[PDB]
Short mmCIF file of C-alpha atoms and ligand atoms in Angstrom, two decimals:
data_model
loop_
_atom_site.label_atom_id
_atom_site.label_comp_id
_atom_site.label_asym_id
_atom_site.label_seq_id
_atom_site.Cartn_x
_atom_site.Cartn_y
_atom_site.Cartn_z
CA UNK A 14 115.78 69.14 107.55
CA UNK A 15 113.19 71.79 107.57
CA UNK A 16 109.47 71.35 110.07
CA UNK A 17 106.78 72.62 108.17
CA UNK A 18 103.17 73.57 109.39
CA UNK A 19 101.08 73.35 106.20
CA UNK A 20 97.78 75.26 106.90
CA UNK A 21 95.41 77.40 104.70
CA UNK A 22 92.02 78.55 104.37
CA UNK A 23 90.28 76.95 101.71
CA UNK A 24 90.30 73.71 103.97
CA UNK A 25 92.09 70.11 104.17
CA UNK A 26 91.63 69.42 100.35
CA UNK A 27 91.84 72.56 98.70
CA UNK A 28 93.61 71.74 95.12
CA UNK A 29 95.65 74.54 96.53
CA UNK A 30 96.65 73.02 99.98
CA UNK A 31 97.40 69.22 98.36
CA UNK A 32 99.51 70.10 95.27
CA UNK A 33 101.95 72.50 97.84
CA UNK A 34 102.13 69.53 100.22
CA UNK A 35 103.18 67.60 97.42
CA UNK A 36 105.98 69.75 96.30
CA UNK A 37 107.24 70.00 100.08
CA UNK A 38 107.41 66.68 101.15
CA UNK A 39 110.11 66.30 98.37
CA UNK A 40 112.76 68.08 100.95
CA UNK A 41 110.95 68.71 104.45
CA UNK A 42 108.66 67.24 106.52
CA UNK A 43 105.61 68.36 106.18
CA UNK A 44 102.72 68.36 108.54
CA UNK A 45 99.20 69.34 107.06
CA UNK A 46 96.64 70.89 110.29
CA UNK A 47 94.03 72.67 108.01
CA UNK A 48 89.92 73.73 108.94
CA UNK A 49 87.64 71.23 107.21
CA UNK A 50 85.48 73.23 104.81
CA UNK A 51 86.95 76.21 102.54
CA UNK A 52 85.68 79.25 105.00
CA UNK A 53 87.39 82.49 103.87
CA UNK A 54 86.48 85.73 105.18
CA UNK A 55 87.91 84.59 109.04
CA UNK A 56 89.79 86.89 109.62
CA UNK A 57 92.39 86.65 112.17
CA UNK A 58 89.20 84.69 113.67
CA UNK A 59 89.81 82.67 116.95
CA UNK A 60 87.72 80.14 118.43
CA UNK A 61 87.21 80.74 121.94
CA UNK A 62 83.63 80.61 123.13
CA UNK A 63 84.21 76.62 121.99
CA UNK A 64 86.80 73.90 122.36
CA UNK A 65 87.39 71.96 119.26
CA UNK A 66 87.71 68.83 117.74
CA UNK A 67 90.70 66.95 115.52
CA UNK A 68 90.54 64.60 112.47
CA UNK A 69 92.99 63.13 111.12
CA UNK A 70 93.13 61.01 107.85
CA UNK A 71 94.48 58.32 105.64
CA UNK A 72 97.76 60.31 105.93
CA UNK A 73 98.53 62.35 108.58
CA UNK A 74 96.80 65.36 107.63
CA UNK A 75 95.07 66.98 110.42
CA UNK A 76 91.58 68.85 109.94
CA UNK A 77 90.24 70.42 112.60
CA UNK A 78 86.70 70.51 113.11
CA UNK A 79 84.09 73.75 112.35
CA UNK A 80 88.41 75.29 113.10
CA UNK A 81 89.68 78.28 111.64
CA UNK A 82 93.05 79.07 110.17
CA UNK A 83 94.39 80.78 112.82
CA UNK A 84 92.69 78.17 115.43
CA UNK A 85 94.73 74.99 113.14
CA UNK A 86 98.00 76.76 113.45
CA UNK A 87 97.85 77.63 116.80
CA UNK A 88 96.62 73.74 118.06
CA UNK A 89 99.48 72.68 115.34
CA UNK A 90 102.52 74.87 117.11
CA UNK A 91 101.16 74.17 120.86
CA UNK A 92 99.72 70.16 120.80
CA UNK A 93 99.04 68.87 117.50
CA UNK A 94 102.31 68.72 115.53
CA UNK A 95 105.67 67.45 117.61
CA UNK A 96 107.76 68.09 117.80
CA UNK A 97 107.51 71.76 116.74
CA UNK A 98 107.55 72.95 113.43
CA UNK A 99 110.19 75.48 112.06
CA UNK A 100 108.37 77.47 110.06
CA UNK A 101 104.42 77.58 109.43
CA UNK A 102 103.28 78.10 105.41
CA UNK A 103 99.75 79.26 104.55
CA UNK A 104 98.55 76.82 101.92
CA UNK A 105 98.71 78.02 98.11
CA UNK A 106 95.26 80.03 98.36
CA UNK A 107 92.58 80.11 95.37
CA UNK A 108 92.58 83.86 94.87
CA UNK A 109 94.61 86.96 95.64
CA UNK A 110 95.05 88.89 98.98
CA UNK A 111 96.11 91.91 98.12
CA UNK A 112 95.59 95.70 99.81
CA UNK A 113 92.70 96.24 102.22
CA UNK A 114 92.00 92.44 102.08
CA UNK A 115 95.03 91.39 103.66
CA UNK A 116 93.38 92.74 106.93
CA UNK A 117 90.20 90.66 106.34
CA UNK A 118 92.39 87.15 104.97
CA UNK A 119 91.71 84.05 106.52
CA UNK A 120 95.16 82.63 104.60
CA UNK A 121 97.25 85.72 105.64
CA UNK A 122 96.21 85.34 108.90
CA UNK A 123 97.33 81.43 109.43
CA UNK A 124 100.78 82.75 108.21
CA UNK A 125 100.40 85.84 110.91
CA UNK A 126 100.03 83.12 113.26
CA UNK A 127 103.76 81.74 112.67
CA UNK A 128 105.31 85.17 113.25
CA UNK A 129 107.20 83.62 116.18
CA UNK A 130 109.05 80.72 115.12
CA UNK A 131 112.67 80.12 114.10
CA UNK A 132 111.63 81.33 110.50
CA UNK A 133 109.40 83.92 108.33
CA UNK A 134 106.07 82.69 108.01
CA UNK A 135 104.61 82.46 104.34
CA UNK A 136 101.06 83.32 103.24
CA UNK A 137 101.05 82.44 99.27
CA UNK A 138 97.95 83.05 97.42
CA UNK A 139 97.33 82.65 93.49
CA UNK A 140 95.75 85.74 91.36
CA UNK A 141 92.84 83.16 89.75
CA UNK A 142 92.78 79.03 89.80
CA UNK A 143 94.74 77.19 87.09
CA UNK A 144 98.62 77.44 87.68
CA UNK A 145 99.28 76.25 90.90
CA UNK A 146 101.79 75.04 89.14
CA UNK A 147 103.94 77.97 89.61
CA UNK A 148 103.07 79.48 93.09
CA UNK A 149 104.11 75.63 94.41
CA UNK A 150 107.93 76.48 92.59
CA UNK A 151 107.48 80.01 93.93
CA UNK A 152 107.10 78.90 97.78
CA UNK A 153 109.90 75.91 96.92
CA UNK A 154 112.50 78.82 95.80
CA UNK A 155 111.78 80.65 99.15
CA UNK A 156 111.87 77.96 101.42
CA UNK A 157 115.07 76.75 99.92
CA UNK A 158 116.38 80.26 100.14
CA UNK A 159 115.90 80.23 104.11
CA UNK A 160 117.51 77.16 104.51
CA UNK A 161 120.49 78.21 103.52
CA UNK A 162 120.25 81.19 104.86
CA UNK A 163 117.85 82.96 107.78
CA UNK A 164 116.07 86.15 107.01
CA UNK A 165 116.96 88.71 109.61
CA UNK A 166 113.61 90.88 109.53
CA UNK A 167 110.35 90.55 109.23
CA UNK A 168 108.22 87.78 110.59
CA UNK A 169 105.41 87.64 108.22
CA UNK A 170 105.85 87.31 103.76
CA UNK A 171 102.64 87.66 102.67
CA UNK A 172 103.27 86.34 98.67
CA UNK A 173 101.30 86.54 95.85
CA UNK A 174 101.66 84.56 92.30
CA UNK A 175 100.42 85.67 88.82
CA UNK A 176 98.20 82.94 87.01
CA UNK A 177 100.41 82.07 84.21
CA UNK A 178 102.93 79.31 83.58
CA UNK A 179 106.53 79.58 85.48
CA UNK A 180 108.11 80.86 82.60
CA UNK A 181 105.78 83.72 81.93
CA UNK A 182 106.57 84.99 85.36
CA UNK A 183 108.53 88.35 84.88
CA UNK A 184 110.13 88.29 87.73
CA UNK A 185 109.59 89.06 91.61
CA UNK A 186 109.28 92.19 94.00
CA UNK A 187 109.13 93.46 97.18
CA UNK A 188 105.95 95.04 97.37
CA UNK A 189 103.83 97.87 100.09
CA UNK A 190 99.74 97.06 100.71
CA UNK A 191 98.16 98.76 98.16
CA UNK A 192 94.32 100.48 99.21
CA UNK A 193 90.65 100.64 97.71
CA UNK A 194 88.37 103.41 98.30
CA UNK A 195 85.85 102.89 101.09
CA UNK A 196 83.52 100.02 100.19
CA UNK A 197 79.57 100.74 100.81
CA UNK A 198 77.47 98.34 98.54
CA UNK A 199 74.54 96.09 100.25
CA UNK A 200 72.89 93.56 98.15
CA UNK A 201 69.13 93.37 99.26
CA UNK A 202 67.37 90.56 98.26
CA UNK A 203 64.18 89.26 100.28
CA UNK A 204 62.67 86.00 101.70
CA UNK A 205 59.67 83.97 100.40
CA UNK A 206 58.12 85.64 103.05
CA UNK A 207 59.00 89.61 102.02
CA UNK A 208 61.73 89.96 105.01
CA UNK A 209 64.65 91.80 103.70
CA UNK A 210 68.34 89.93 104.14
CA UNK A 211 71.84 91.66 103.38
CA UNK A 212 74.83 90.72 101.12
CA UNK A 213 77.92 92.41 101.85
CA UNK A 214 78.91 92.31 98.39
CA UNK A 215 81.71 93.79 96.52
CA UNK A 216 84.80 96.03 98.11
CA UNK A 217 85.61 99.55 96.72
CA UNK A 218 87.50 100.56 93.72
CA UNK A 219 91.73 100.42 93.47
CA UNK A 220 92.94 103.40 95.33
CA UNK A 221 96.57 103.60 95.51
CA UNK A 222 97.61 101.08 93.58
CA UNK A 223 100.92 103.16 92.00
CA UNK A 224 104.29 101.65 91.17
CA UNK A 225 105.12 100.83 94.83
CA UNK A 226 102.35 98.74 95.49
CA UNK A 227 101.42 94.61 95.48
CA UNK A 228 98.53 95.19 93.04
CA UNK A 229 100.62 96.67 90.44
CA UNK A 230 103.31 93.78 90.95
CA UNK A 231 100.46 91.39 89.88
CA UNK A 232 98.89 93.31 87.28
CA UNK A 233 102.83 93.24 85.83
CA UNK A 234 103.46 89.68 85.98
CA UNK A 235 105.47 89.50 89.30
CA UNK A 236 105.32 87.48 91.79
CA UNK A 237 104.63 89.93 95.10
CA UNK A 238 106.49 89.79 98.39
CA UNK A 239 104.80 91.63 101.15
CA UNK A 240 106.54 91.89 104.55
CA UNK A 241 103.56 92.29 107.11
CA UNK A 242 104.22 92.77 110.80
CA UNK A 243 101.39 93.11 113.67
CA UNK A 244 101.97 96.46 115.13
CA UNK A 245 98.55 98.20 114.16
CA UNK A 246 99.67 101.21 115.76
CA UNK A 247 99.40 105.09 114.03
CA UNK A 248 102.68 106.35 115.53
CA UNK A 249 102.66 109.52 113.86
CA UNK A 250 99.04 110.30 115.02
CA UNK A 251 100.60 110.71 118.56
CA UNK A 252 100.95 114.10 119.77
CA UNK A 253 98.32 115.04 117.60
CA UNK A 254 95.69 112.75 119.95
CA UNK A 255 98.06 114.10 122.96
CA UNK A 256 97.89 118.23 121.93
CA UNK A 257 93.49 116.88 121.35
CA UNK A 258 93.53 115.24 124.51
CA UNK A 259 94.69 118.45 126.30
CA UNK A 260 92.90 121.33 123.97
CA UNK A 261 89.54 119.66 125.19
CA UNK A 262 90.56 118.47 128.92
CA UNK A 263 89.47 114.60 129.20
CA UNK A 264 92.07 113.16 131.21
CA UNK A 265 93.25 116.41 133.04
CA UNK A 266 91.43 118.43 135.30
CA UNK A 267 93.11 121.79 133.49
CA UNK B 14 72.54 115.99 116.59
CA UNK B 15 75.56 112.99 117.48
CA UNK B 16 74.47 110.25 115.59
CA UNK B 17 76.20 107.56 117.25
CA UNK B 18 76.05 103.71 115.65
CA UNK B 19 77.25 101.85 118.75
CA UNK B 20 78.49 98.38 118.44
CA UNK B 21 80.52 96.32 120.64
CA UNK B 22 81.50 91.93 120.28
CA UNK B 23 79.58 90.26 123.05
CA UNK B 24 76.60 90.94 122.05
CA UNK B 25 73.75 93.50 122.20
CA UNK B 26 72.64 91.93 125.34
CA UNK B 27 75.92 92.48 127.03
CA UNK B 28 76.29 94.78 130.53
CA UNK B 29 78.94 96.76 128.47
CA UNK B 30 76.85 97.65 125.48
CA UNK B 31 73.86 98.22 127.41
CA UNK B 32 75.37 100.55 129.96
CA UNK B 33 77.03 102.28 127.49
CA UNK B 34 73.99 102.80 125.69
CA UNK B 35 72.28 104.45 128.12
CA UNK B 36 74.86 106.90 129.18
CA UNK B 37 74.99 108.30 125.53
CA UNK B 38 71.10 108.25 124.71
CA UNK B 39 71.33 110.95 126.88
CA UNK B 40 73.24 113.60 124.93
CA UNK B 41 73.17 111.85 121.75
CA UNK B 42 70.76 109.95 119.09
CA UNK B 43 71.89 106.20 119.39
CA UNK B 44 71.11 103.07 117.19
CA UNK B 45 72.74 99.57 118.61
CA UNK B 46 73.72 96.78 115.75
CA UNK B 47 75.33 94.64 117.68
CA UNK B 48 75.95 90.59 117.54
CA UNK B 49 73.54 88.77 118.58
CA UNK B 50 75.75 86.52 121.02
CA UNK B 51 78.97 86.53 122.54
CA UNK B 52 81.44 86.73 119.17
CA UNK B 53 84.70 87.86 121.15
CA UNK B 54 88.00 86.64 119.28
CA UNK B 55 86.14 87.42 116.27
CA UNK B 56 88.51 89.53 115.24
CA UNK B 57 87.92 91.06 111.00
CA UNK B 58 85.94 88.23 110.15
CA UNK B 59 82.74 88.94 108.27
CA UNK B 60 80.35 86.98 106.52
CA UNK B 61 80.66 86.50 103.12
CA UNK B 62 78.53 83.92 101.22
CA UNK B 63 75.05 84.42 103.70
CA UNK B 64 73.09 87.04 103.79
CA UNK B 65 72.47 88.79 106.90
CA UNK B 66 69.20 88.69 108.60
CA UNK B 67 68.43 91.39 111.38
CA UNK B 68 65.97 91.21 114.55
CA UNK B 69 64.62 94.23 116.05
CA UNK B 70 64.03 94.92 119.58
CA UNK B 71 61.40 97.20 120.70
CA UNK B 72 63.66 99.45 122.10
CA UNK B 73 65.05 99.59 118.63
CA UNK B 74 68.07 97.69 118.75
CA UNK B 75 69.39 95.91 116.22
CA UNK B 76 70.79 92.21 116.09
CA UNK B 77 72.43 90.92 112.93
CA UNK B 78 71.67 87.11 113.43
CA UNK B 79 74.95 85.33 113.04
CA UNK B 80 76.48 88.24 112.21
CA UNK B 81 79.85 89.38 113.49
CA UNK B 82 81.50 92.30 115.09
CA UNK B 83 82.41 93.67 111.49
CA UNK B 84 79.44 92.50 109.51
CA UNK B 85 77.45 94.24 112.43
CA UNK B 86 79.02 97.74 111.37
CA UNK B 87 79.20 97.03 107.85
CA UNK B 88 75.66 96.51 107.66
CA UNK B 89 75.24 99.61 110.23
CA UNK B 90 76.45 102.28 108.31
CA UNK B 91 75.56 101.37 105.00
CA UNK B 92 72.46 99.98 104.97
CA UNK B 93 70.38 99.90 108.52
CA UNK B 94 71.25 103.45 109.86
CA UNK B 95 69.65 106.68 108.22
CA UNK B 96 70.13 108.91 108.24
CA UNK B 97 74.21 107.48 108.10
CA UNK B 98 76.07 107.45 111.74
CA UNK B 99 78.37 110.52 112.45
CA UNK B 100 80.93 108.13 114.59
CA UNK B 101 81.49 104.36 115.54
CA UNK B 102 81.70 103.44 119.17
CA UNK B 103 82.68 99.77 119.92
CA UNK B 104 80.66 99.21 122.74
CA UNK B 105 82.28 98.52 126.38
CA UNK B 106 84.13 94.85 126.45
CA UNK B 107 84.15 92.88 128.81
CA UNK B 108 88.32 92.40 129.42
CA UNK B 109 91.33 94.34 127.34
CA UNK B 110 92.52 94.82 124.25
CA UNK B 111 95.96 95.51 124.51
CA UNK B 112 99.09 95.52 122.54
CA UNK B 113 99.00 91.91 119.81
CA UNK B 114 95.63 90.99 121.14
CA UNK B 115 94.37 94.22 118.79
CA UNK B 116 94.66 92.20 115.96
CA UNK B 117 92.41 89.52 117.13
CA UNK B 118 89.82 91.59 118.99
CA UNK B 119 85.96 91.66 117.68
CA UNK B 120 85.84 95.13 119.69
CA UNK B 121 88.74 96.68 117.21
CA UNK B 122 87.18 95.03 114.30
CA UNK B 123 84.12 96.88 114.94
CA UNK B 124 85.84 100.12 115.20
CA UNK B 125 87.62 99.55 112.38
CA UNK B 126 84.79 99.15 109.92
CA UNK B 127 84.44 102.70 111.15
CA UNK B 128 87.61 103.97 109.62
CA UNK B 129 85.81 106.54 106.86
CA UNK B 130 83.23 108.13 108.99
CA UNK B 131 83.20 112.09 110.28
CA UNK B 132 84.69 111.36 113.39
CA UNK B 133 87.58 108.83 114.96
CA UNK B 134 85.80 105.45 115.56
CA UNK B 135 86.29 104.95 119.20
CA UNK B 136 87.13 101.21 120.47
CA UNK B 137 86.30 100.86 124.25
CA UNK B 138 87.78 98.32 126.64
CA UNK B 139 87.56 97.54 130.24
CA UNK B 140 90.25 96.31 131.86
CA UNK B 141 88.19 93.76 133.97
CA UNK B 142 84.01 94.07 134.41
CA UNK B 143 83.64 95.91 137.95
CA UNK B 144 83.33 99.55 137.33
CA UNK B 145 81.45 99.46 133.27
CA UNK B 146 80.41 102.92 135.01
CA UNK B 147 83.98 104.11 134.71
CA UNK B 148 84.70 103.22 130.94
CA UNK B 149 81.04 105.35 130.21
CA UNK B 150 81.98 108.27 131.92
CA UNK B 151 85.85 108.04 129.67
CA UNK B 152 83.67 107.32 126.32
CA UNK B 153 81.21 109.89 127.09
CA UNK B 154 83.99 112.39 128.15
CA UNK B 155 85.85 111.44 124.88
CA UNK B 156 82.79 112.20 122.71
CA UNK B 157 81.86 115.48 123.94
CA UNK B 158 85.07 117.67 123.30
CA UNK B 159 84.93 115.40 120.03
CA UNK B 160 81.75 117.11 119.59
CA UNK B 161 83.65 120.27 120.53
CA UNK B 162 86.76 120.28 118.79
CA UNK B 163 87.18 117.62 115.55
CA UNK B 164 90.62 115.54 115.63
CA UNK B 165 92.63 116.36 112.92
CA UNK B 166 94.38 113.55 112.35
CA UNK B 167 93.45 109.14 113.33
CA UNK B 168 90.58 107.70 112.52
CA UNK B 169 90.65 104.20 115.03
CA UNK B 170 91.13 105.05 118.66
CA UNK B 171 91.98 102.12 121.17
CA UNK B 172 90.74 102.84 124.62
CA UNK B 173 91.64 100.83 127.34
CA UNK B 174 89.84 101.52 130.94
CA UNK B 175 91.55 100.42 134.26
CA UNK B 176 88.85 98.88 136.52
CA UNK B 177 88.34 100.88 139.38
CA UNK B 178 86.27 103.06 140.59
CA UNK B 179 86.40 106.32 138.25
CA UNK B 180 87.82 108.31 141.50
CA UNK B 181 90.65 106.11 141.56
CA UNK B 182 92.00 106.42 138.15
CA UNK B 183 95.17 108.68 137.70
CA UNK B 184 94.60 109.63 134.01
CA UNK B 185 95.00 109.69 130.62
CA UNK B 186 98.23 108.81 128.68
CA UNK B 187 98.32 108.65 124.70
CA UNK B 188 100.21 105.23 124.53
CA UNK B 189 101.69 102.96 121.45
CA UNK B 190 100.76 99.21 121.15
CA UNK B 191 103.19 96.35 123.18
CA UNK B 192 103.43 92.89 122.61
CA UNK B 193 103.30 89.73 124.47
CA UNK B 194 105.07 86.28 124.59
CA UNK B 195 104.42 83.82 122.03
CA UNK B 196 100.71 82.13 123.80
CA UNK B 197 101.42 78.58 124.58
CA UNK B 198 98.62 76.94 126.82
CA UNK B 199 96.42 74.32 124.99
CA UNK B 200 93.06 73.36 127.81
CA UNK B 201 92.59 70.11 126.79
CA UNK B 202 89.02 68.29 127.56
CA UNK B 203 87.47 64.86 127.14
CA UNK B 204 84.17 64.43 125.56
CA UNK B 205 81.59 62.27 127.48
CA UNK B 206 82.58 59.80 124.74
CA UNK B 207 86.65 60.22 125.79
CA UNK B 208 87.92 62.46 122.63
CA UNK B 209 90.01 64.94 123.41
CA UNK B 210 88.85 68.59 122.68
CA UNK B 211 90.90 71.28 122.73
CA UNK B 212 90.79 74.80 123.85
CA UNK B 213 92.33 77.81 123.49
CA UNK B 214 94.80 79.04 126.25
CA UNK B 215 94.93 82.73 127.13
CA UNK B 216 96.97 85.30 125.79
CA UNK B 217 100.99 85.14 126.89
CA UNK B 218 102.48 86.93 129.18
CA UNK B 219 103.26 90.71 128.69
CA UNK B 220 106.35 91.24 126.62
CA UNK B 221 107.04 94.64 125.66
CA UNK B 222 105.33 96.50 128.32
CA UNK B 223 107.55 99.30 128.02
CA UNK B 224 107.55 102.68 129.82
CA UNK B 225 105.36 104.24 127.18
CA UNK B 226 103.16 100.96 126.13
CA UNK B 227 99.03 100.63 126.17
CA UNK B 228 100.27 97.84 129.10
CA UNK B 229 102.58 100.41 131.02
CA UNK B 230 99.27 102.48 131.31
CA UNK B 231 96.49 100.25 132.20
CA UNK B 232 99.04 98.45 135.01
CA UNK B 233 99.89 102.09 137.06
CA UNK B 234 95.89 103.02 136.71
CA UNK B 235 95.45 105.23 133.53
CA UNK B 236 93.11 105.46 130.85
CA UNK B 237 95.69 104.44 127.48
CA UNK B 238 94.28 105.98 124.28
CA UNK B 239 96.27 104.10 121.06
CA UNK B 240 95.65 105.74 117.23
CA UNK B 241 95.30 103.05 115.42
CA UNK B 242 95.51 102.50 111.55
CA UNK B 243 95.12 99.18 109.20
CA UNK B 244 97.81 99.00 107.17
CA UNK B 245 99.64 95.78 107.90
CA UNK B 246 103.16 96.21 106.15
CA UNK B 247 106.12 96.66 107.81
CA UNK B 248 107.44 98.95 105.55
CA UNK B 249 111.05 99.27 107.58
CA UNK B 250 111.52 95.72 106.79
CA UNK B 251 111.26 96.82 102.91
CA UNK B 252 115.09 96.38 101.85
CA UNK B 253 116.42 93.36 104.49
CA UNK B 254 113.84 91.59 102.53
CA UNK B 255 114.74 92.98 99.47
CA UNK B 256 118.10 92.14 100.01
CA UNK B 257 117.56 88.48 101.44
CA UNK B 258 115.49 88.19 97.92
CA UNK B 259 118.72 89.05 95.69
CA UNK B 260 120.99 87.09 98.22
CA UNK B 261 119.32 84.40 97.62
CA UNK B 262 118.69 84.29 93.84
CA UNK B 263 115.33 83.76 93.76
CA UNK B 264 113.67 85.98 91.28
CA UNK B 265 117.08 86.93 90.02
CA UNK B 266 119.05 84.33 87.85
CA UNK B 267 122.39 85.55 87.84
MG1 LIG C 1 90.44 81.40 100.20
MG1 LIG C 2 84.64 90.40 123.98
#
């Protein structure tokens, strides 16, 4: 009977977090460790200059205090929930995470975190706020489908669900990171006392976002399946930094 | 003529930054935003519903209060530097980045954000905090011969400095990313009131340190140079998941 770390990044009572916790309890265990106040934009954020402190509730939900996701999964693999859980599943999240974002997710990254226990880890994230509905069935289908049997590859399924009722969902898809064009906008907007202060503000236009790609799966009606992995690595941009490295001599005295 | 926006994660105050600064100012025009305290494990987090407020310092450095690695170089190129920076360098840290630990590293982050510019953002780490002296002379060898010759091909470079004095370091060696051990260790501490706290262990031990890994380097005494890109799918896990999907039946009825 299937361990589950329930974490996400909205925090502890996230409509998102509650309603999958719900729906799992009906055939696993589930064990809840999420932060305490909806903070997306962590990234793969770690506390470290700061030890941290626990809550937990009526329940046995744990949140942990000023925590991140990736700080609740790790204190729920390695002291909070025992004994260990199987798998770790990032919390139905209110809004996609799809392309360049993925980097920057606070949800994907909690899932990231369970890329080394007995089964995939599952970020699941809803395009928009009404049906959680479906991306709850949509986790249940996969997390039935590894119990009765184990996926050999890939540590990390990073899924995304349309906002529409189950049976308006086409279908599902295996899906690539799709890309935006460079973003470069900075809100101004000034004090009381004329001192300028910056908004980051909103990310590039859809670059490739062809057939292949997880924004296209959404924009169809399907349900997205990205496998991520956590090898940031360019391997093709070797010799060429190896033929640079020798052309202009750092590293070699000829 | 270099315009340089230099950056790092612990904080504009930090010996790595600062020395770094220096050497550079001396062939190059430099402008610091930098965090304004010690942000390492900050990883791509960035601040999202605040804005930003900056301090100057008479030297001219920037601060983004409360801002982090990648809201420091955000900010940097596309509002506080102008004319806009012709490279990112991700000032000298204090301790590695190598192999997993990439994708949690404020340093990286920085670099990252630096993806679109002219030149390769350059992410600089010292294996240690002795000889800061011998990850300048690296950089600043790295940037001229940039300056000389462009690289055709990455944009994110992952430099990793042994610590010893610069006589004492064999070389150079184009390397790919390993990986550790799951990280275990949870420090815990009481509060003066008897609550536990809990902190964050280190890093696991070295995994895949492999013959041609970023660890294989740093370990025999060279300078490891990693290309690094962001996209996070592991696109050779495509059909194994693709097949799991229709082995399973979900997203398939028949
Ligand atoms: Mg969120
Ligand atoms: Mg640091």
């Amino acid at each position: 009977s299937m361990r589950i770390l329930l974490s996400n990044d909205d925090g502890v009572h996230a409509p998102g977090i509650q309603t999958l916790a719900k729906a799992l309890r009906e055939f696993a265990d589930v064990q809840v460790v999420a932060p305490d106040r909806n903070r997306s934009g962590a990234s793969n954020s770690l506390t470290l200059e700061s030890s941290l402190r626990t809550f937990t509730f009526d329940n046995g939900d744990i949140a942990v205090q000023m925590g991140t996701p990736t700080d609740c999964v790790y204190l729920g693999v390695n002291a909070l929930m025992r004994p260990r859980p199987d798998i770790v599943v990032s919390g139905i999240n209110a809004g996609p995470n799809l392309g360049d974002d993925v980097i920057y997710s606070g949800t994907v990254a909690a899932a990231m975190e369970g890329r080394h226990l007995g089964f995939p880890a599952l970020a699941v994230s809803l395009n928009g706020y009404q049906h959680y509905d479906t991306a709850a069935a949509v986790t249940c289908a996969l997390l039935r489908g590894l119990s009765r049997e184990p996926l050999r590859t890939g540590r990390i399924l990073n899924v995304n669900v349309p906002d529409l009722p189950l049976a308006q969902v086409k279908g599902i898809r295996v899906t690539r990171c799709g890309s935006r064009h460079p973003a470069d906008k900075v809100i101004p907007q000034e004090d009381p006392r004329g001192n300028t202060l910056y908004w980051i503000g909103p990310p590039g236009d859809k670059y490739d976002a062809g057939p292949d790609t997880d924004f296209a799966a959404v924009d169809e009606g399907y349900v997205s399946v990205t496998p991520l992995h956590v090898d940031l690595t360019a391997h093709s941009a070797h010799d060429v930094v190896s033929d640079w490295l020798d052309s202009v001599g750092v590293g070699t005295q000829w």
